[PDB]
Amino acid sequence: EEKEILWNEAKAFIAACYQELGKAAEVKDRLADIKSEIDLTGSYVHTKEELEHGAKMAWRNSNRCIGRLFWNSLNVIDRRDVRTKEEVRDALFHHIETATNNGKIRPTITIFPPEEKGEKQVEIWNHQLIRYAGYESDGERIGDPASCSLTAACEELGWRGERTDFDLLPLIFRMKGDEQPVWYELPRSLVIEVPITHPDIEAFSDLELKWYGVPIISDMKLEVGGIHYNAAPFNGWYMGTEIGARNLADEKRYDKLKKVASVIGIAADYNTDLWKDQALVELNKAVLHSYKKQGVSIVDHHTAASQFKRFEEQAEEAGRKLTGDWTWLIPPISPAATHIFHRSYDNSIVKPNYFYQDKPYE
Amino acid sequence: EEKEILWNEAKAFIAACYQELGKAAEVKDRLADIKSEIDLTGSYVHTKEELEHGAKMAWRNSNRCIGRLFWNSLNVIDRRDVRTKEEVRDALFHHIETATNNGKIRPTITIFPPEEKGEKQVEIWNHQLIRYAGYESDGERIGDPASCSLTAACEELGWRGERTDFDLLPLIFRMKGDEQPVWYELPRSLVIEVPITHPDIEAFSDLELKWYGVPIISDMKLEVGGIHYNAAPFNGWYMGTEIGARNLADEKRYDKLKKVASVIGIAADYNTDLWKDQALVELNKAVLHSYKKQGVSIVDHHTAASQFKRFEEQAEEAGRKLTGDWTWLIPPISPAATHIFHRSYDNSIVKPNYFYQDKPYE
Numbered sequence: 091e092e093k094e095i096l097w098n099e100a101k102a103f104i105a106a107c108y109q110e111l112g113k114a115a116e117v118k119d120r121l122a123d124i125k126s127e128i129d130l131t132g133s134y135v136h137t138k139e140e141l142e143h144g145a146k147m148a149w150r151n152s153n154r155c156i157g158r159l160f161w162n163s164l165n166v167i168d169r170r171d172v173r174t175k176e177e178v179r180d181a182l183f184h185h186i187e188t189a190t191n192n193g194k195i196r197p198t199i200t201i202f203p204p205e206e207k208g209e210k211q212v213e214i215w216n217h218q219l220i221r222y223a224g225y226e227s228d229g230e231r232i233g234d235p236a237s238c239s240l241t242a243a244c245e246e247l248g249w250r251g252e253r254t255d256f257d258l259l260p261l262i263f264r265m266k267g268d269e270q271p272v273w274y275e276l277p278r279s280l281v282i283e284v285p286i287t288h289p290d291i292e293a294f295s296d297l298e299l300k301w302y303g304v305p306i307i308s309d310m311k312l313e314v315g316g317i318h319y320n321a322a323p324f325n326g327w328y329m330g331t332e333i334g335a336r337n338l339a340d341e342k343r344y345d346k347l348k349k350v351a352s353v354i355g356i357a358a359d360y361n362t363d364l365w366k367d368q369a370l371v372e373l374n375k376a377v378l379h380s381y382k383k384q385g386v387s388i389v390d391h392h393t394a395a396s397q398f399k400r401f402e403e404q405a406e407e408a409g410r411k412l413t414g415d416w417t418w419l420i421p422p423i424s425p426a427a428t429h430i431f432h433r434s435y436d437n438s439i440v441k442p443n444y445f446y447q448d449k450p451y452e
Numbered sequence: 453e454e455k456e457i458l459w460n461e462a463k464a465f466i467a468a469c470y471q472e473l474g475k476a477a478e479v480k481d482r483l484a485d486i487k488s489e490i491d492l493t494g495s496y497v498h499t500k501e502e503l504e505h506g507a508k509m510a511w512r513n514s515n516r517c518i519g520r521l522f523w524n525s526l527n528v529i530d531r532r533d534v535r536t537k538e539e540v541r542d543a544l545f546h547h548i549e550t551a552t553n554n555g556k557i558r559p560t561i562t563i564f565p566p567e568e569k570g571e572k573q574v575e576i577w578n579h580q581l582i583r584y585a586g587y588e589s590d591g592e593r594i595g596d597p598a599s600c601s602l603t604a605a606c607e608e609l610g611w612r613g614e615r616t617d618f619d620l621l622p623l624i625f626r627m628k629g630d631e632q633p634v635w636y637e638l639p640r641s642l643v644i645e646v647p648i649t650h651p652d653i654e655a656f657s658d659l660e661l662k663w664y665g666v667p668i669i670s671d672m673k674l675e676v677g678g679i680h681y682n683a684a685p686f687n688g689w690y691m692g693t694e695i696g697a698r699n700l701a702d703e704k705r706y707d708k709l710k711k712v713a714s715v716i717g718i719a720a721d722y723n724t725d726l727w728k729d730q731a732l733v734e735l736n737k738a739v740l741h742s743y744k745k746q747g748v749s750i751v752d753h754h755t756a757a758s759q760f761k762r763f764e765e766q767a768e769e770a771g772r773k774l775t776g777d778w779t780w781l782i783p784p785i786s787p788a789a790t791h792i793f794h795r796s797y798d799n800s801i802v803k804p805n806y807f808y809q810d811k812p813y814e
């Protein structure tokens with residue numbers, strides 16, 4: 091079954107991919123080569139063109155992603171050649187620097203060797219390459235609560251955080267053949283961060299909030315024609331609400347709304363005052379203003395939705411079915427002000443795609 | 453099949469209902485009576501206790517309703533005795549007055565005779581008993597665009613609106629046996645309306661916005677143990693966002709956000725300014741403030757969600773499965789600030805329940 095699952099996926103992927111690249115005539119021979127290779131080796135190797143286009147199709151099929159208009163401009167870095175942890179580390183450093191691009195963020199994915207027989211060659215522990223640590227002890231909470239378990243795992247391995255609210259977690263990954271992951275401190279010169287200020291409320295800086303410029307998801311498996319790239323970190327730029335309405339606002343994250351209410355000079359006493367809503371809007375305004383002021387790429391939820399509308403129109407024009415997850419596409423600030431809220435989406439899963447996988451710790 | 457569908461529903465309803473009312477011992481005899489009656493007459497008649505509890509269970513099972521905590525306090529008016537249009541009209545007038553209760557709104561349902569063989573005894577045309585007319589002609593738009601088709605149907609029948617933006621539609625319904633519905637102008641003394649002002653922005657009154665106090669849904673079918681009450685208008689009080697974030701804000705409704713932006717003194721030029729979001733919050737603040745100031749019942753979305761949490765806890769304690777429609781339960785303003793956004797709901801349909809039915813015009 092396992093080898094048969096592989097061939098079926100390979101057949102479906104190669105037809106669709108070559109069809110899109112105008113290479114339909116080459117499908118027959120390529121499929122022949124692939125079948126022999128699966129018979130001989132138990133797997134097959136993608137061409138660079140297949141791998142690149144596979145990564146792009148996977149983004150295009152990501153139901154939960156509002157940013158999909160730009161799927162075809164994904165920058166694909168092929169690192170299937172990596173064999174050592176120094177090579178992994180340096181490829182990750184390189185991804186951070188080239189994706190960041192001095193603030194003009196380039197959507198990028200770095201693809202490491204795929205799983206062999208469900209056996210990982212490189213097992214990444216970080217949820218994102220750049221992420222803040224989190225600590226909870228004796229009632230005391232510091233940093234990002236969502237990082238508590240990885241943070242504890244890093245410290246078990248000899249790392250120590252400074253216990254500010256914004257400690258950068260080190261990169262941490264394990265190589266096939268090692269019992270323990272290794273970790274490396276992020277060079278601060280690689281990491282752009284944005285202090286959060288407000289366009290007209292001077293006191294807002296008293297909160298001393300910041301966030302990192304580039305979100306680089308490093309814990310998802312990219313699947314392309316039956317090949318499982320468990321290690322394939324990718325980035326885009328942020329939609330403002332991810333930071334203002336969730337990372338900084340959620341009670342189980344940085345939980346800043348009451349503090350926001352205070353500095354913008356409103357009472358946080360009555361539900362009917364909609365103080366949480368007002369705080370959310372001002373904090374979200376501050377986040378967009380701060381990123382733009384620093385020349386770091388970001389998109390507001392209105393502009394992102396307008397772009398997504400164009401993505402929908404583009405799918406229809408190309409004769410491709412559109413899939414989407416309504417519950418994730420709607421922004422968490424004023425969702426009914428976007429077209430998304432007022433229509434429905436087929437949440438069917440199409441491959442290539444990005445998938446969750448179990449974490450290697452806990 | 454039709455008669456068999458009826459008996460199966462009746463059996464399931466009577467068991468559950470009597471079980472809830474501690475009347476389990478009486479199920480056997482009641483079921484016997486019902487079966488004879490279905491055999492003799494092709495239907496059966498609910499007792500007042502069944503009818504009342506059925507209407508309450510139906511509210512409790514309404515997946516899309518955030519207000520369900522108070523299901524058991526529904527005030528049920530039994531008007532199965534109605535035979536004339538004067539009786540219908542007067543029952544509807546009475547419902548408006550007793551539900552409104554000088555502003556201390558009482559959740560109420562008035563239940564008219566049920567369908568016989570899919571044949572309606574009373575066919576209500578209004579979507580709500582109190583609702584504003586809408587007009588579109590020669591590019592000119594007046595009133596509520598969502599009322600355009602019923603408004604045109606009323607005017608075909610000799611009604612004429614004044615063409616303000618807030619014309620009250622007349623009650624309009626048809627009796628079994630008549631080819632044409634009748635219509636009656638709402639007595640203005642029955643209708644509470646709330647002018648929309650803002651707690652600290654004096655200029656907000658320049659917009660001259662208002663809304664009616666009591667939403668009375670008059671176009672849904674109540675189904676209880678296989679009996680179809682197509683005409684059974686019900687009301688609660690408003691959640692503020694229904695008015696501030698949708699009725700007054702949607703582009704295809706009153707579309708007031710740009711005008712709101714102007715009176716609150718902000719530019720409506722840049723998506724990144726989140727002017728729509730800020731306008732939404734201030735308009736929603738104004739709506740809550742205005743209702744409270746006038747002593748008309750209303751709930752904000754934070755308080756409603758907290759109540760809904762208690763409803764969830766209550767279902768669990770009672771050993772009842774909870775059903776819900778996540779996409780409707782989340783409020784359209786700051787949904788991620790409520791617990792609802794962060795969990796999921798089983799959207800299974802349980803009866804008794806309220807259902808859509810085709811409109812009798814167009």
Ligand code: HEM
Binds near residue numbers: 148154155157197
């Ligand atoms: C170019 C700018 C992009 C923007 C503004 C954007 C925006 C978003 C947002 C707001 C989410 C929801 C995340 C959350 O609520 O936590 C999301 C989800 C997602 N995006 Fe994008 N995205 C972009 C680029 C990309 C790229 C380059 C990829 C991969 C090649 C990608 C794949 C995904 C996936 C897989 C998810 C779902 C993650 C999950 O299920 O947990 N996106 N995107």
Ligand code: HEM
Binds near residue numbers: 507689691751
């Ligand atoms: C007591 C105060 C109540 C509040 C605050 C409340 C709140 C709400 C809200 C906000 C909605 C969504 C409506 C929309 O977006 O257009 C809703 C839907 C609904 N409510 Fe309630 N509700 C209340 C009482 C009731 C009562 C008394 C009933 C019937 C006995 C009821 C049955 C429903 C139904 C059937 C829907 C769904 C309508 C549809 O599918 O279109 N609710 N409720």
Ligand SMILES: N=C(Nc1cccc(COC[C@@H]2C[C@H](OCc3cccc(NC(=N)c4cccs4)c3)CN2)c1)c1cccs1
Binds near residue numbers: 237306332
């Ligand atoms: N357990 C792990 N990670 C982990 C640890 C703690 C918490 C979480 C929560 O993650 C699950 C969901 C997944 C989701 O993650 C954040 C996310 C996902 C996708 C896009 C974006 N935002 C962007 N603008 C972009 C980023 C990249 C391109 S665009 C953010 C929220 N939350 C995961 C694993 C490590 C290794 C394997 S699994």
Ligand SMILES: N=C(Nc1cccc(COC[C@@H]2C[C@H](OCc3cccc(NC(=N)c4cccs4)c3)CN2)c1)c1cccs1
Binds near residue numbers: 687690811
């Ligand atoms: N076509 C008809 N009506 C009609 C006409 C124009 C537009 C619409 C749109 O209606 C569909 C959905 C249905 C939904 O209606 C508004 C609504 C439904 C339920 C609760 C509330 N809000 C409340 N707080 C409460 C009211 C009562 C108790 S709590 C509001 C929105 N929109 C219907 C019909 C007339 C007769 C039979 S069908």
Ligand SMILES: C[C@H](O)[C@H](O)[C@H]1CNc2nc(N)[nH]c(=O)c2N1
Binds near residue numbers: 793795
């Ligand atoms: C339970 C619910 O499905 C869950 O909280 C989802 C809702 N929609 C979301 N949408 C986005 N974009 N991001 C999220 O983390 C979530 N959380």
Ligand SMILES: C[C@H](O)[C@H](O)[C@H]1CNc2nc(N)[nH]c(=O)c2N1
Binds near residue numbers: 434779781
């Ligand atoms: C298409 C989408 O399902 C639709 O616009 C829904 C979304 N959720 C909603 N939720 C509520 N409460 N009311 C609505 O009218 C809608 N509209």
Ligand SMILES: [Cl-]
Binds near residue numbers: 305332337
């Ligand atoms: Cl994030």
Ligand SMILES: [Cl-]
Binds near residue numbers: 667694699
């Ligand atoms: Cl309404």
